[PDB]
Structures are given as structure tokens and as C-alpha cells.
Amino acid sequence: VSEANGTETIKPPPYGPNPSDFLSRVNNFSIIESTLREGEQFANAFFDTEKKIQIAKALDNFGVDYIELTSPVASEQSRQDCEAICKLGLKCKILTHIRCHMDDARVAVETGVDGVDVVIGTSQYLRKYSHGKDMTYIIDSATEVINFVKSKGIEVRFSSEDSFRSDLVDLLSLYKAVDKIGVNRVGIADTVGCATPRQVYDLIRTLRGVVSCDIECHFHNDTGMAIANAYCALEAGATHIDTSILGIGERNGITPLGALLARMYVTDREYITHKYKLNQLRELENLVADAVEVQIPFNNYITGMCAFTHKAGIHAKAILANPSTYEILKPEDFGMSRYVHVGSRLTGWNAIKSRAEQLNLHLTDAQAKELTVRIKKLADVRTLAMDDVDRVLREYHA
Amino acid sequence: VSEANGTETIKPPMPYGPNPSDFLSRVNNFSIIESTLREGEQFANAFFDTEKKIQIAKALDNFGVDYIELTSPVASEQSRQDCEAICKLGLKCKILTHIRCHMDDARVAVETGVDGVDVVIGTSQYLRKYSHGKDMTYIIDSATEVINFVKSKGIEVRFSSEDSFRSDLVDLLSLYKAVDKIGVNRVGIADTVGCATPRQVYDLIRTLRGVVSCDIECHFHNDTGMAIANAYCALEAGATHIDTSILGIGERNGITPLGALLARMYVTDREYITHKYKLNQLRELENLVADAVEVQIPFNNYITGMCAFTHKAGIHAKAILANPSTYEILKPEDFGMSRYVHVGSRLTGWNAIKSRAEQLNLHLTDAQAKELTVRIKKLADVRTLAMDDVDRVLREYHAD
Ligand SMILES: O=C(O)CCC(=O)C(=O)O
Ligand SMILES: O=C(O)CCC(=O)C(=O)O
Ligand code: NA
Ligand code: NA
Ligand SMILES: [Zn+2]
Ligand SMILES: [Zn+2]
Numbered sequence: 191v192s193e194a195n196g197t198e199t200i201k202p203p204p205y206g207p208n209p210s211d212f213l214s215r216v217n218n219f220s221i222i223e224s225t226l227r228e229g230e231q232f233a234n235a236f237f238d239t240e241k242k243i244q245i246a247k248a249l250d251n252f253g254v255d256y257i258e259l260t261s262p263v264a265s266e267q268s269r270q271d272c273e274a275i276c277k278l279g280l281k282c283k284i285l286t287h288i289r290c291h292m293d294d295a296r297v298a299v300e301t302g303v304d305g306v307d308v309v310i311g312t313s314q315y316l317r318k319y320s321h322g323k324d325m326t327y328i329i330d331s332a333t334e335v336i337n338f339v340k341s342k343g344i345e346v347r348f349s350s351e352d353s354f355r356s357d358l359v360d361l362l363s364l365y366k367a368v369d370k371i372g373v374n375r376v377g378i379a380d381t382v383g384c385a386t387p388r389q390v391y392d393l394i395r396t397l398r399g400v401v402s403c404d405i406e407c408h409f410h411n412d413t414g415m416a417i418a419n420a421y422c423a424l425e426a427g428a429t430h431i432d433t434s435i436l437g438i439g440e441r442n443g444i445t446p447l448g449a450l451l452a453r454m455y456v457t458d459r460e461y462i463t464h465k466y467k468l469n470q471l472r473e474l475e476n477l478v479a480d481a482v483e484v485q486i487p488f489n490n491y492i493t494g495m496c497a498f499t500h501k502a503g504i505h506a507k508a509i510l511a512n513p514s515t516y517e518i519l520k521p522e523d524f525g526m527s528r529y530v531h532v533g534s535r536l537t538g539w540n541a542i543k544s545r546a547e548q549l550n551l552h553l554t555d556a557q558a559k560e561l562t563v564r565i566k567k568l569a570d571v572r573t574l575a576m577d578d579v580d581r582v583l584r585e586y587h588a
Numbered sequence: 589v590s591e592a593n594g595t596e597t598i599k600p601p602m603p604y605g606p607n608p609s610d611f612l613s614r615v616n617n618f619s620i621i622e623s624t625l626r627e628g629e630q631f632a633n634a635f636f637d638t639e640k641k642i643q644i645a646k647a648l649d650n651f652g653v654d655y656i657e658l659t660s661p662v663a664s665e666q667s668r669q670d671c672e673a674i675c676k677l678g679l680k681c682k683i684l685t686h687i688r689c690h691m692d693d694a695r696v697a698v699e700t701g702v703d704g705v706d707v708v709i710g711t712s713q714y715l716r717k718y719s720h721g722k723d724m725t726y727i728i729d730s731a732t733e734v735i736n737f738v739k740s741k742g743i744e745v746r747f748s749s750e751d752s753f754r755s756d757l758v759d760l761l762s763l764y765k766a767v768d769k770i771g772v773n774r775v776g777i778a779d780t781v782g783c784a785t786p787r788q789v790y791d792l793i794r795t796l797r798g799v800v801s802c803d804i805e806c807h808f809h810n811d812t813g814m815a816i817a818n819a820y821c822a823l824e825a826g827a828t829h830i831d832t833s834i835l836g837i838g839e840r841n842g843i844t845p846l847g848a849l850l851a852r853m854y855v856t857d858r859e860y861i862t863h864k865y866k867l868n869q870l871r872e873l874e875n876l877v878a879d880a881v882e883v884q885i886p887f888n889n890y891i892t893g894m895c896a897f898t899h900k901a902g903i904h905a906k907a908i909l910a911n912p913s914t915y916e917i918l919k920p921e922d923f924g925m926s927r928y929v930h931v932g933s934r935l936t937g938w939n940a941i942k943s944r945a946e947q948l949n950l951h952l953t954d955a956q957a958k959e960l961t962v963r964i965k966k967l968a969d970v971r972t973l974a975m976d977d978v979d980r981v982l983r984e985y986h987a988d
Contacts, residue, residue, distance in 0.1 A: 192717075192726040193729055196719075196724050196727065197724070199723040199725045200761045228907075230900075230904045233900060234975050236934060264906060264907075287907060318590070324597035325594045325595070325597060326594055326597045327590040352915070363595065367593070370594075370595050382914075383917055386817075386824075387821060388790060388821060400598065411888075412855075413848075413852040413855050414816030414851065415852070416813075418785075418818075421785060421786070422787060440912070441898060441899070442888045442889075442890065442895055449812075452811070452812050482975075483972060483975055484974050485976050488883045489886070491813060491841065496631070496840065496842075497811075501631070504659075505629045505663070507660075508626070508627075508629075508660070509839070510710055513839070516751070518811050519811060564970075571970055573882060576632070576882055577883060
């Protein structure tokens with residue numbers, strides 16, 4: 191039934207793609223996985239060679255196109271680890287992260303890397319007036335590094351620290367200069383964690399117009415924008431995004447690998463599910479979690495205890511449609527069996543059983559008991575946490 | 589030294605100031621509707637009793653939020669009673685309850701004493717039809733009277749539609765326009781499913797801002813990592829109110845987290861956020877919820893997670909070119925902490941406690957230090973420590 195408090199319907203004035211969409215890289219981009227560089231800055235990371243090798247092997251199998259390693263001049267161990275990893279015959283390309291110096295580059299090339307991701311310092315380029323023109327130059331010695339690396343057949347990308355806090359006149363002029371010389375890629379880094387998504391879109395879109403090469407983005411997560419900035423970077427034409435497993439890095443870290451893949455999955459399911467072995471993500475996160483001794487957060491994307499939960503009960507009635515209507519991520523696409531519908535809270539073995547069934551761990555009668563004994567001995571110490579269920583199950587595989 | 593591989597410096601053309609769209613921005617002038625006691629009740633492990641809801645409400649009030657939202661008093665008798673109980677505490681902030689669009693639900697809401705009702709309208713409660721040759725959208729009679737009843741009783745009203753980013757725009761914008769014509773305090777946008785992207789949020793809210801004249805509320809799920817970014821872009825586009833939840837707790841992986849939102853807004857305008865909210869209360873506020881829903885604070889939680897204020901010292905700090913102290917967008921003192929912790933080697937046992945306790949401004953007695961060192965041993969005895977074990981054993985400790 192109706193009365194005269196309605197309004198004329200707002201209709202728009204044929205539809206197709208906007209010119210912008212053509213530049214978008216949302217279903218066609220590369221991850222540069224940086225667990226073995228930026229991740230080494232994580233407060234509790236102390237990877238030894240064996241552990242670096244396992245992480246590299248597992249990243250390669252997972253499907254990433256590049257892995258980035260700590261500068262081989264950081265330390266002798268670092269140099270050796272870089273050599274070792276370059277000899278495993280991975281399919282993905284191997285990059286190393288270096289300052290813009292000749293010695294750093296020689297050593298990088300010696301170790302066998304496929305490319306050097308270079309950071310240029312603000313002293314390695316100046317503006318000057320020359321024959322009545324405002325001119326930006328990359329200084330002689332710094333230009334030499336690019337040419338050397340190119341001559342030895344190796345990929346080069348050049349970036350600047352703290353890109354969102356630099357003067358745009360300097361920053362864009364530098365990237366145009368580097369582009370005239372010729373690199374594979376330039377990089378943008380929100381080192382400080384202050385960039386906002388529209389700010390990112392606007393900058394990358396402009397960079398895309400200034401240079402002709404590829405564009406890499408590196409986003410810190412101090413203020414919760416790292417996944418959102420990666421996404422807007424992609425919409426604007428960025429071709430490569432730096433990630434880290436569980437985002438581990440300096441302070442609270444960077445764009446988390448799993449989080450990014452969750453976002454990109456929703457945008458294009460076939461693309462992501464075929465490129466990456468998604469069912470391997472738990473096992474990939476657990477490996478790092480174990481090494482850096484952290485627990486997987488209860489609300490971790492995809493793989494946290496609660497990511498695939500629906501509330502059953504009086505509180506489900508707050509949403510109007512069936513709660514199963516709202517399932518943007520399909521658990522099977524990530525190796526899981528279902529959304530778990532939670533009414534009562536499950537203590538003890540009931541909690542293990544549920545989560546284990548969800549994770550596709552076909553457990554023994556014998557394993558059920560070992561686990562139950564271990565959770566009792568844990569609760570004897572203090573109250574359990576949702577987090578503990580994933581922790582006791584860490585050593586178990588689908 | 590230089591050689592002719594430079595270029596024309598790119599310079600913008602010749603005075604700079606604010607763009608018109610900036611004037612619509614609410615980034616330093618917006619309200620939080622805190623929904624720990626509504627959306628948070630959908631958290632997989634939430635079972636708040638009355639005593640606990642009262643404590644969370646008192647602590648939210650003190651903290652500085654303008655609104656707290658409660659579960660429908662019609663969901664159950666206990667809900668009804670808890671809603672009455674919270675409305676009688678004399679909180680400064682306003683108390684809203686979340687309800688379906690029905691007269692019975694609205695009557696009871698008003699009776700309990702709420703300051704406002706946050707209503708969700710269903711798909712069957714509005715039509716499109718042709719009336720005298722014009723394409724017309726109507727709120728149905730039975731739904732419209734809910735609005736008027738509540739208004740007649742002096743209570744605030746907001747109307748939302750569920751799953752806004754997956755509706756037809758023709759339907760959705762026409763509904764909000766109809767609702768605005770009838771007159772409400774607020775309309776709400778909800779990304780129930782967790783699929784909205786920030787530029788898409790910006791575009792929709794700026795448009796909604798052009799369509800209606802009332803306030804605009806936003807609710808964002810975090811399935812894909814966009815909840816804080818969407819809140820931010822919503823604010824830039826004119827949204828006036830944002831739904832949050834302590835630690836984000838809600839359905840699935842939850843919604844815009846209170847602390848995370850405050851970290852984002854703090855960077856945008858330090859003075860505004862530090863004066864409005866008691867930021868040094870945040871740890872206590874999260875721990876109270878963490879205890880109730882039996883979770884650990886993630887190691888990488890914004891502001892308050894173990895590693896949020898850590899710089900790596902050593903060979904790996906040389907990866908960034910400036911000194912690590914240059915990159916401290918959040919000041920630890922603004923949040924009740926003492927400093928960034930510079931980590932070289934891994935601390936263990938008492939050492940780890942000492943470090944984090946000092947960072948947190950816990951002035952620990954000798955007796956407490958030993959209690960903690962004992963409990964930490966008893967923990968390591970069961971399995972290897974995680975870095976979140978440090979915060980967990982420290983949870984029942986407070987700053988002076
Ligand atoms: O080299 C880069 O592009 C990134 C360096 C980095 O980690 C940062 O700026 O936070
Ligand atoms: O009432 C609203 O606006 C939000 C309801 C909700 O939690 C949701 O859509 O996820
Ligand atoms: Na171009
Ligand atoms: Na308007
Ligand atoms: Zn970084
Ligand atoms: Zn919700």
C-alpha cells in the first residue's frame with residue numbers, strides 16, 4: 191500500500207568501459223614477495239639460511255613472479271644466502287634490494303640475481319639551471335650503476351624513499367630522468383605509512399603519464415591503508431606490488447600477501463585462483479609464523495580463526511538476508527571446507543574438531559588425543575583463546 | 589658532477605589553495621557510532637552478559653565516542669533488559685539501537701529509552717510504480733508510519749539498506765531520496781558483504797551527498813582489507829558518521845576497527861583526535877573486549893599490537909636510507925606509550941616482559957615482576973612463546 195510521500199525515481203540519462211579502465215592492472219600484475227627482505231625488518235625475524243631456502247621454495251611453488259632478498263652487502267651471511275637462493279633453480283625471478291652504489295651492484299650481479307631493486311638517495315640527483323632551462327640530473331656515479339647493471343644483462347628498478355612526503359617537482363622529475371636513461375621499473379614507496387588511497391591513485395596515474403616503463407609500489411600499514419593503496423595503485427596502472435607474508439616488516443609491516451590475494455580474488459576469481467596455489471596459503475603463513483614466533487591473528491584475512499564464521503542465533507537476525515548470502519570468499523577456493531556457523535562457544539576438543547574439519551585435516555583417533563591432552567595442559571596455565579586452537583593445529587596438514 | 593642524461597624538470601603551471609570538494613570533507617569533523625555492543629555481538633566468540641555490556645558502555649562513554657549502538661531490544665528479553673539498563677546509566681554519549689522497520693520493534697525501542705533508532709529497511713518495503721506517467725519510488729505506508737511514530741516520540745531516526753554496493757543504483761538512490769523527503773536524521777550505507785573498494789565508496793557517497801540533505805552513516809566489513817580505507821574515503825566524500833567496533837569484532841572478520849580508524853584520523857589531524865578521544869585509554873579498552881571474547885591482540889594490531897612501535901636495529905635497518913626514527917607517523921606518547929622499541933636481538937622471558945612493560949608505562953613492583961617471570965616460564969613449558977604471549981601475560985596490568 192502507498193500514499194503521496196514518494197518521489198520521482200532518479201534514473202541516469204549505452205554503457206561500456208571508461209578510458210581509465212584500460213590502464214588498470216587489477217587482473218594482470220605481478221607480486222614481488224618481500225618476506226625475505228622487508229620481512230627481515232620484522233621485530234622478531236631471525237631467518238637462517240635453511241629457513242630462507244624453505245620460504246623461497248614455498249613462495250616459488252605458491253606462484254609469485256618475484257622474490258626480493260636483503261642486499262648481499264648487508265653482511266657476509268647475506269651475500270652467501272643470496273648466492274644459495276639464486277642456485278636453487280626457482281621459476282620465479284630473484285631480486286635483491288640495494289643502495290645506489292657501484293660496489294653493491296657488482297656484488298649483486300656476482301651472486302646471480304635476476305635484478306636489482308635500487309633505492310636512490312636525495313644526494314644522487316640535483317636540479318640546476320642549464321642554458322636557461324630548469325634541469326634535473328642523476329649524478330654521474332649514480333648513472334654508472336644503471337648502465338653497468340644493464341650491461342651485465344640484469345633487470346633494474348629505481349625507487350625513492352618516502353615518496354608521499356617528497357616535493358612532487360623533485361620526485362616526478364627524477365622518475366622522468368631515470369626513464370630517459372632507461373630502466374625496467376620505477377618504484378613508489380610509502381615508507382612512513384601515511385598515504386591515502388585517492389592520493390595513491392592520483393600519484394600513480396600521473397606517474398603512469400610521466401614514464402614509459404613499469405611501476406612498482408611499496409606500502410606500509412601503520413594506518414590501515416596498505417591493502418587499499420595496493421588496490422588503487424593497481425587501478426591506476428601499477429604493474430608490480432610488494433607484499434610480505436602476514437605483512438611482516440618494519441613497525442606493523444606492509445601489504446600482506448594473503449590480504450592482497452583476498453582483495454584481488456573478489457575482483458577476478460579465475461585470474462587469481464589459476465595463477466596462485468591458494469590452498470597453500472595456510473601452510474605458507476604457518477611457516478613464517480613459526481619462524482618469527484607469532485600467532486596467526488584471530489581476524490587474519492582468509493586464514494584467521496574467524497574469517498569464515500557466521501553467527502548463528504539471536505544475533506544473526508541483525509542481517510536481513512540469510513547469512514550465507516554474504517560469502518564473498520569461497521572457502522573451497524582456499525582449501526577450506528565451509529563457513530562455520532557458531533551458536534554456542536566450543537570448549538576444548540570440540541573447538542579443535544570444528545576448526546580441523548574446516549581446515550581439511552583428516553585427523554587420527556591418536557592425533558585427536560595428543561591434541562586434546564595438549565589443549566588441557568595449555569588451559570591449565572591460563573584461559574584459552576580462539577588463537578590457541580589454530581596454534582595447537584599448526585603442525586598438521588591437509 | 590653531471591652529463592647530458594638529465595631532462596626538463598616537470599613543474600606545474602603558474603596560486604594553490606583548497607578545491608571545492610575539500611569543503612565537503614568530514615575528515616576532522618565526524619562522529620563515531622561504536623557498535624561493539626551490536627555488530628560485535630555477531631563476533632564468533634562474543635557472549636556478553638549485562639555486567640560486561642555495562643562495563644564496555646561505561647568505558648566507551650569515557651573514551652569519547654558520541655554514539656554507542658546496541659542490539660535490537662526485540663532480539664530477546666535479555667536484549668530488552670540490557671538496553672533499558674544501559675539507557676539508565678546516564679552516559680554522555682547517545683544511545684542507539686539497531687532495528688528492523690516494524691512498528692512493534694520501534695515501540696519497544698522507544699519504551700527502553702534509546703536516543704535514536706538505526707533502522708534497516710527491507711527490499712519489500714518500497715516500490716517502483718508509474719503514477720500519472722512519471723517513474724515513481726514509494727516507501728510503503730506501513731514502513732512510513734514507523735518513521736513518523738519515532739519522530740513523533742522525539743527520537744532520532746536513521747534508515748539503511750543492507751548490501752548497498754550490490755544493489756541497483758536506480759533503486760538505492762531513489763529510496764534514500766524518498767526517505768529524505770519524509771525526513772530523517774540520517775541515512776546509512778552498508779557494505780555488508782566486504783566487497784566495496786575505496787574509489788567506489790568515494791564515488792557513491794559524494795553522489796549520495798548530492799541526493800539527500802541529512803547526515804550520512806557508513807558501515808564497512810573488512811573481508812578484503814578495505815574497511816579502514818572505505819571509512820576514510822567515505823569521510824572525504826561527506827559521510828558524517830562511521831560505525832566501528834573495538835578490534836573490528838563483528839560478523840566474519842568484522843568491520844572498521846575503532847583503534848585503526850583513530851590511528852588513520854590522528855595522522856590526518858592530530859589535534860582534533862587527541863583532544864576529542866582519550867587515546868591513552870585504548871589499550872585498556874581493547875583488553876576489556878579481548879578478555880570477554882577470549883582473543884589475543886594481534887602482534888600487528890594498529891597502535892596497540894606488540895610490533896606497532898618497533899624499529900629493527902642492526903644490518904636490516906640499513907635497508908631504509910634515513911635513520912629509522914624519521915618514520916614515526918604515530919607518536920607513542922600520544923597513545924600512552926613511552927617510545928619506539930629498537931630491536932636488535934630477540935628478547936626472551938623476563939627481558940621481553942621488562943621491555944614491553946616499560947613501553948606500556950606499567951610501573952611494575954618487584955613482586956609483580958616475579959609473578960610474571962614465573963607465569964612466563966610456566967607458559968614456555970607448554971610450547972614455544974609467541975611474541976603475543978608478552979602482551980597476554982601483561983593484560984591484567986595498568987599504567988599508574
Ligand atoms: O625500496 C623500496 O622501494 C622500499 C623500501 C622500503 O621498505 C620502504 O620504503 O619502506
Ligand atoms: O544497519 C546497518 O547499516 C548495518 C548492518 C550490518 O551490520 C551490515 O550490513 O553488515
Ligand atoms: Na606514459
Ligand atoms: Na545535497
Ligand atoms: Zn618498507
Ligand atoms: Zn555489519
